[PDB]
Design a binder for these strands. Structure first.
Ligand SMILES: [K+]
Ligand SMILES: [Mg+2]
Ligand SMILES: [Mg+2]
Ligand SMILES: [Mg+2]
Ligand SMILES: [Mg+2]
Ligand SMILES: [Mg+2]
Ligand SMILES: [Mg+2]
Ligand SMILES: [Mg+2]
Ligand SMILES: [Mg+2]
Ligand SMILES: [Mg+2]
Ligand SMILES: [Mg+2]
Ligand SMILES: [Mg+2]
Ligand SMILES: [Mg+2]
Ligand SMILES: [Mg+2]
Ligand SMILES: [Mg+2]
Ligand SMILES: [Mg+2]
Ligand SMILES: [Mg+2]
Ligand SMILES: [Mg+2]
Ligand SMILES: [Mg+2]
Ligand SMILES: [Mg+2]
Ligand SMILES: [Mg+2]
Ligand SMILES: [Mg+2]
Ligand SMILES: [Mg+2]
Ligand SMILES: [Mg+2]
Ligand SMILES: [Mg+2]
Ligand SMILES: [Mg+2]
Ligand SMILES: [Mg+2]
Ligand SMILES: [Mg+2]
Ligand SMILES: [Mg+2]
Ligand SMILES: [Mg+2]
Ligand SMILES: [Mg+2]
Ligand SMILES: [Mg+2]
Ligand SMILES: [Mg+2]
Ligand SMILES: [Mg+2]
Ligand SMILES: [Mg+2]
Ligand SMILES: [Mg+2]
Ligand SMILES: [Mg+2]
Ligand SMILES: [Mg+2]
Ligand SMILES: [Mg+2]
Ligand SMILES: [Mg+2]
Ligand SMILES: [Mg+2]
Ligand SMILES: [Mg+2]
Ligand SMILES: [Mg+2]
Ligand SMILES: [Mg+2]
Ligand SMILES: [Mg+2]
Ligand SMILES: [Mg+2]
Ligand SMILES: [Mg+2]
Ligand SMILES: [Mg+2]
Ligand SMILES: [Mg+2]
Ligand SMILES: [Mg+2]
Ligand SMILES: [Mg+2]
Ligand SMILES: [Mg+2]
Ligand SMILES: [Mg+2]
Ligand SMILES: [Mg+2]
Ligand SMILES: [Mg+2]
Ligand SMILES: [Mg+2]
Ligand SMILES: [Mg+2]
Ligand SMILES: [Mg+2]
Ligand SMILES: [Mg+2]
Ligand SMILES: [Mg+2]
Ligand SMILES: [Mg+2]
Ligand SMILES: [Mg+2]
Ligand SMILES: [Mg+2]
Ligand SMILES: [Mg+2]
Ligand SMILES: [Mg+2]
Ligand SMILES: [Mg+2]
Ligand SMILES: [Mg+2]
Ligand SMILES: [Mg+2]
Ligand SMILES: [Mg+2]
Ligand SMILES: [Mg+2]
Ligand SMILES: [Mg+2]
Ligand SMILES: [Mg+2]
Ligand SMILES: [Mg+2]
Ligand SMILES: [Mg+2]
Ligand SMILES: [Mg+2]
Ligand SMILES: [Mg+2]
Ligand SMILES: [Mg+2]
Ligand SMILES: [Mg+2]
Ligand SMILES: [Mg+2]
Ligand SMILES: [Mg+2]
Ligand SMILES: [Mg+2]
Ligand SMILES: [Mg+2]
Ligand SMILES: [Mg+2]
Ligand SMILES: [Mg+2]
Lengths: 386, 154
RNA sequence: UUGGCGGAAAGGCCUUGGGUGCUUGCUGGCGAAUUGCAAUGUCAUUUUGCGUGGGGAUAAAUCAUUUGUAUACGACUUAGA
RNA sequence: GCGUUGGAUUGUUCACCCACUAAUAGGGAACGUGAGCUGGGUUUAGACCGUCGUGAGACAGGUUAGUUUUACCCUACUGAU
RNA sequence: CUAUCUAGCGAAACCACAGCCAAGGGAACGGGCUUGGCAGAAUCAGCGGGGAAAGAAGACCCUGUUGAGCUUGACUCUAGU
RNA sequence: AGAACUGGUACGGACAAGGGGAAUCUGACUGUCUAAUUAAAACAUAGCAUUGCGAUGGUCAGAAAGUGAUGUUGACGCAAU
RNA sequence: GUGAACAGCCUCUAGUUGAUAGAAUAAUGUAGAUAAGGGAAGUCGGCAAAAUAGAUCCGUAACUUCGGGAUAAGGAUUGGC
RNA sequence: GCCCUGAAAAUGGAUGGCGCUCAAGCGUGUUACCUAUACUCUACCGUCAGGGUUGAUAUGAUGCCCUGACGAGUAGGCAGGCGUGGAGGUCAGUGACGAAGCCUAGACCGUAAGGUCGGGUCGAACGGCCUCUAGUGCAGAUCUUGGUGGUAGUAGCAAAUAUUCAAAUGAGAACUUUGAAGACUGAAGUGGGGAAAGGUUCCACGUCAACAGCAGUUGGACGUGGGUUAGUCGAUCCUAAGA
RNA sequence: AGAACUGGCGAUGCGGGAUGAACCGAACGUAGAGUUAAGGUGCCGGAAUACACGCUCAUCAGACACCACAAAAGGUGUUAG
RNA sequence: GUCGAAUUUGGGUAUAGGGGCGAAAGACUAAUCGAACCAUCUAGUAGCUGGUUCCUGCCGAAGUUUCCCUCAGGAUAGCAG
RNA sequence: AUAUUGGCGAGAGACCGAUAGCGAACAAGUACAGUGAUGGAAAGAUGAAAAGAACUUUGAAAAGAGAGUGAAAAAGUACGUGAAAUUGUUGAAAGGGAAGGGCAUUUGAUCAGA
């Protein structure tokens, strides 16, 4: 008989299976549609989630109860040092989909990216790309032949880039290598851009700008095996329930005489690939710019790094992307920031945000001070120093 | 005497056996199959490493619901264990067979485990007490173990 | 051997030049038998191994240790001459 | 496609009313669903009442109290090698 | 504290044969049969849909020319008086 | 028993240790029982009432007895409700 | 010793240090806890839990068989020196 | 007439499926073709029936032979046979130069029940035929007794706060002994004695195969010994309900 | 649910109706060859994508009895009267 | 819940199976109680459930009639050898 | 003259042959259960003879490997034979949600007859 009281199902069947992602770096499964009139540019970027903080800004939203008023907003900081271009892949269209025709690599690959090709780097003889780099012996005839093939074919061009983890506080030391689609016309010009940028760095400001809507693609934080109550949000069973209450009472009707795929079951929670869209960039800050965390309203000469450092991450010393709100993945995780797949004109996008103040109080507690100078000014002289 | 079926040269072989050994027949079968065909010194080193938990005995037949380990990868399995008691009994028999080979004057460096078989000895029966005044069996499954090491020839 | 084209799974298509063999286009000389009155009467190509020569290149992965962005165990993700 | 509720009384399905709501549609799945629960009711044994019966006892009448066992197998499902 | 993994130890229930579905027909709700869908070793932790799962020759109901406890001017007797 | 002083107004500092009120049904109360599903309103109870009996007796045992219980009793008693 | 106390808690004499262990810290459990705002809307039902609690002082209703109800209810205080 | 509307149900699904549109649909007609354990013909088996042949070298007239037809089968009936224990007779049967039994994807006979042979194993008996006889043939009976699996190295060995370091002993020590430390029972004890009950468990020496659901060098275990001393403590005596 | 007659199933395989106790065909010793029954001959699948005259286009077409359903009423759909 | 009296309890003693004992639940009477346990009568009876052991050959049913305290049975006729 | 599942002494069998035959072929009315009345098993076989394995070697040891005894150790007191279930090893083969079966042939292996 019927359910006797209607209620929406628990969870989204489109995010199935709730299994562990096959990689710690979530795949970009779609790049922006290519507009072959614009200049050649990366469609995405690689960064590392540093942490969260809060900003204050005046809201520019006519008709709102908070128009021209100050609002406090959570922001996520993504450490984004320049990525190194080390390769270029050509993709030909086939009746079976896109197929990589060939890949041309840079002549010199740094140990950062060479470590990606090894499970035991320290005891290896580090032979990776040693025979390939000889293809640049005298004139690079083989390299130019492969690039000519990419131009003659390969309706889609993607560059191979890798992060510079040595510039992050992470202990990993093994770089993240990814394909980023080159948008901007003239497949020939895409290949020329890739070849010229071989062994060269691309900074995050050449890809993203202030107020832009971007998408964050990352593997969520892992939580291991989870019961249905927190994995799917099902109702806790009553206290009187024998055999436990963090369960789904009826996992199926008599017929079909099978548990169905749509029934909440205990299993892995977290560590899933997610692609969350429409996160507005609030800052495109630069590592070389001391007073990274300053605004035109604050002027306090401070970097984005909170007092004591980003908890479990470290200090931001590179270029960084501050997006509004939160993004999937935990701190220290590699994230991919990609340009929006559509042209959003909604007055939520297209809003020009100007930060008034960025919180740099310690996130290791109820941080009361923005700067060590401010802590000294409030507390006066202490016994050890100050 | 009267071992299981063997196909080697008895003049180039040395045998050892232990009967009614109070050690798990299933664990000891897995242990014996782990070293079946191995060179003698290699097998002895491997059994010592198993004792040290550096390598494992792959459990291939008697392995339902045992548990998974990374040390089974070298044998292409996920289920492996470290049955120390079975390993110790097998080491005792390997040492006995090596001693018999040296008494026979065989080349100790050419010795490999040419045959090793474990079958079930008579069960030693104890009792266990169950709810509502019931009694069940609590038996051991002891092992007969036999092995012969032979000189590897061409 | 000259050059060109072919990426949809191209792995093929075309083309230059000389060399060599055959040519049933035509006309001769020699041979075939006994597989006994037929017997698929063995003619193809698939992989593997070995030996003889020539040519070429001179790593990793796993276990163990280690990390916690991971985790019931496996697995994952790190580090280590 | 999408949603179709919060409550008072009653074990209740049903009913009824209060109230919100865009709406408070109807149904099935062994009258879905007890090795999922619960056990208020029903539905053993204790007990009380009324009617009936000479009586033992009866009542699809009322009332009160009344043990809810097992998965480690196979498959299915969820995750994992 | 378990569960979990390991060393040692080591039972039981249960078991025709076994174990993927849909529909059909069929003892009128199939794991097997028919027609389709399909289908790739070996597995770990969970799980309670199904095995019309286990537990017990249904205790309800009916039948038996089967009882027993109990009752009464049933039939037939009897201690006692 | 009292007073001053004292403190991050804490102080039966852990331990230990009544929730309370307004009513209805029901049994007076304390007590008792279905050991292993029912502790109750069931049973008992004091109180009330009825009944039999003066011993050659009432009530009740025993197969029977020169046999027994009440009875080491006697109606303010014993026996049966 | 604390304390009203053969309570609980700690200790002396005496006795024991015996319950298979090691490693991890998933789900679900068992046992023990906490929780913003609301406060029984949950449920058959406040089941479970919470709240109360010692002592001193004050104050204590209906009703009543005059004995009680009664720790009714409801307030205050408590250390150390 | 065909088609359409009328024409709504619950897992996804059924002209059997695919699929089919001058059909691979519907109505109708004509041929060819496919194939049942049916029909025709032939062989072989058996059954039944009708016959021939005691005239010889003729031992199988229950024999041999000729001819025709027939063959489904539960419950059930009958017939002819196969196999087992034992019995009378016989083969002057087999056998320690290997009986019986058992094993044997080795061989042969029989439609079959079964029979025969080879090879291995083994060690003391056994068989063919004519008859006699029965406690004579198993897949079942929630059969009986015994044995053995899968489950499964699985469930689990989680109450009683708790262990740790070192040395000694030993083949071997989480568990034995000593020392050290940390804890607990906290006198209504995890202390010291007794009654019932047990019966040697007490104690020493030796000692670990089994038992102590891990272990064990330890033990209430195993082996061997030692040990319980009364005029006064009990019984014994008294009587109680009662016998 | 109950009768009549016959034929069947039970007691029965075989070919066909996909599947099915009963329908159609046909009943059965072991084989060979031929021919057929019922039913079929696009492919599954043995066998004409045979021949012939028409009809039908369905945004739920139809597709062989038993049999696994559809009606009244309607339509310048289209066909023939 | 109760915890100083209808209190708890040891030992001795009495009551024994249609009997005891029962502050009464058909409770208890050695895990046994709406009649204990043990042995025998007893291989109790069963119109009821289950099973019923080699091969082949030939024939081959009935579920209908009448009667029955008969309706899950039998006798009788029929069908069969 | 008749009876005689008890006692004592005898002779027998178309009887049973260790799950049979008495419950008991054996330290069987035993061990063991029950308060008790009572209930009540399991359990025979080395070999002619212990000739029951001296001695060596590995092991802490049990034991193993040799040696030896014996007709045989394919008889080692866990003892005649030594089935099946179930199991180890070896060898052969097959294996997309069971397996097994029938007809037919291919392939591999194996084999009789002439
Ligand atoms: K009764
Ligand atoms: Mg609904
Ligand atoms: Mg959430
Ligand atoms: Mg419960
Ligand atoms: Mg913080
Ligand atoms: Mg498993
Ligand atoms: Mg487990
Ligand atoms: Mg137990
Ligand atoms: Mg018990
Ligand atoms: Mg239901
Ligand atoms: Mg259920
Ligand atoms: Mg249930
Ligand atoms: Mg229910
Ligand atoms: Mg109830
Ligand atoms: Mg009742
Ligand atoms: Mg009356
Ligand atoms: Mg199905
Ligand atoms: Mg159906
Ligand atoms: Mg089934
Ligand atoms: Mg199929
Ligand atoms: Mg599979
Ligand atoms: Mg479960
Ligand atoms: Mg189920
Ligand atoms: Mg029944
Ligand atoms: Mg019954
Ligand atoms: Mg009758
Ligand atoms: Mg009667
Ligand atoms: Mg009362
Ligand atoms: Mg009770
Ligand atoms: Mg109770
Ligand atoms: Mg009363
Ligand atoms: Mg005091
Ligand atoms: Mg709260
Ligand atoms: Mg609060
Ligand atoms: Mg409140
Ligand atoms: Mg409510
Ligand atoms: Mg409610
Ligand atoms: Mg209510
Ligand atoms: Mg409560
Ligand atoms: Mg008060
Ligand atoms: Mg009051
Ligand atoms: Mg229609
Ligand atoms: Mg067709
Ligand atoms: Mg036609
Ligand atoms: Mg004749
Ligand atoms: Mg016949
Ligand atoms: Mg006999
Ligand atoms: Mg023989
Ligand atoms: Mg065989
Ligand atoms: Mg002999
Ligand atoms: Mg018999
Ligand atoms: Mg049998
Ligand atoms: Mg049978
Ligand atoms: Mg059975
Ligand atoms: Mg049995
Ligand atoms: Mg376990
Ligand atoms: Mg437990
Ligand atoms: Mg404990
Ligand atoms: Mg100590
Ligand atoms: Mg304590
Ligand atoms: Mg203490
Ligand atoms: Mg002692
Ligand atoms: Mg032990
Ligand atoms: Mg031990
Ligand atoms: Mg020792
Ligand atoms: Mg002793
Ligand atoms: Mg005295
Ligand atoms: Mg019948
Ligand atoms: Mg028929
Ligand atoms: Mg059909
Ligand atoms: Mg024929
Ligand atoms: Mg065809
Ligand atoms: Mg019409
Ligand atoms: Mg009653
Ligand atoms: Mg009988
Ligand atoms: Mg016939
Ligand atoms: Mg019947
Ligand atoms: Mg006997
Ligand atoms: Mg025997
Ligand atoms: Mg008894
Ligand atoms: Mg024997
Ligand atoms: Mg012999
Ligand atoms: Mg033997
Ligand atoms: Mg076998």
């Amino acid at each position: 008989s019927h359910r006797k009281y209607e209620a929406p199902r628990h969870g989204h069947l489109g995010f199935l299976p709730r299994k562990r992602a096959a990689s710690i770096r979530a795949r970009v499964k779609a790049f922006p549609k290519d507009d072959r009139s614009k200049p050649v540019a990366l469609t995405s970027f690689l960064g590392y989630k540093a942490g969260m903080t809060t900003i204050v800004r005046d809201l520019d939203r006519p008709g709102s109860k908070f128009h021209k008023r100050e609002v406090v907003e959570a922001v996520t900081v993504v450490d984004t040092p320049p990525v190194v271009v080390v390769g270029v892949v050509g993709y030909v269209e086939t009746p079976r989909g896109l197929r990589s025709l060939t890949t041309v690599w840079a002549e010199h690959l740094s140990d950062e990216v060479k470590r990606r090709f090894y499970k035991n780097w320290y005891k290896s003889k580090k032979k990776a790309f040693t025979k390939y780099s000889a293809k640049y012996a005298q004139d690079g005839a083989g390299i130019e032949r492969e690039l000519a093939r990419i131009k003659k074919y390969a309706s889609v061009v993607r560059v191979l880039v890798h992060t510079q983890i040595r510039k992050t506080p992470l202990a990993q030391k093994k770089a993240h290598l990814a394909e980023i689609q080159l948008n901007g016309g003239s497949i020939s010009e895409k290949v020329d851009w890739a070849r010229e940028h071989f062994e060269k760095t691309v900074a995050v400001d050449s890809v993203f700008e202030q107020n832009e809507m971007i998408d964050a693609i990352a593997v969520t934080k892992g939580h291991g095996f989870e019961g249905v109550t927190h994995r799917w949000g099902t109702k806790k069973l009553p206290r009187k329930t024998h055999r436990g209450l963090r369960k789904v009472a009826c996992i199926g009707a008599w017929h079909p005489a099978h548990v169905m795929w749509s029934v909440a079951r205990a299993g892995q929670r977290g560590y899933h690939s997610r692609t969350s869209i429409n996160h507005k960039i609030y800052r495109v800050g630069k590592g070389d710019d001391e007073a990274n965390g300053a605004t035109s309203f604050d002027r306090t000469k401070k970097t984005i790094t909170p007092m004591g450092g980003f908890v479990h991450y470290g200090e931001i010393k590179n270029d960084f992307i501050m997006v509004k709100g939160c993004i999937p993945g935990n701190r220290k995780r590699i994230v991919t920031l990609r340009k929006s797949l559509y042209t959003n004109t909604s007055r939520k996008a297209l809003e020009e945000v100007s930060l008034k103040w960025i919180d740099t109080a310690s996130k290791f507690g109820k941080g009361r001070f923005q700067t060590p100078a401010e802590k000294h000014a409030f507390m006066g002289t202490l016994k050890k120093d100050l | 005497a009267r071992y299981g079926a063997t196909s080697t040269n008895p003049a180039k072989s040395a045998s050892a056996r232990g009967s009614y050994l109070r050690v798990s027949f299933k664990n000891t079968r897995e242990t014996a199959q782990a070293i079946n065909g191995w060179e003698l010194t290699k097998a002895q080193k491997y059994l010592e490493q198993v004792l040290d938990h550096q390598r494992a005995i792959p459990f291939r037949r008697f392995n339902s619901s045992i548990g998974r380990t990374a040390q089974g990868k070298e044998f292409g399995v996920t289920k492996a264990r470290w049955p120390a008691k079975s390993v110790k009994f097998v080491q005792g028999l390997l040492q006995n067979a090596a001693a018999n080979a040296e008494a026979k004057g065989l080349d100790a460096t050419k010795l490999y485990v040419s045959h090793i078989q474990v079958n079930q000895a008579p069960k030693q029966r104890r009792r266990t007490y169950r709810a509502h005044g019931r009694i069940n069996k609590y038996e051991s499954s002891p092992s007969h173990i036999e092995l012969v090491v032979t000189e590897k020839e061409e």
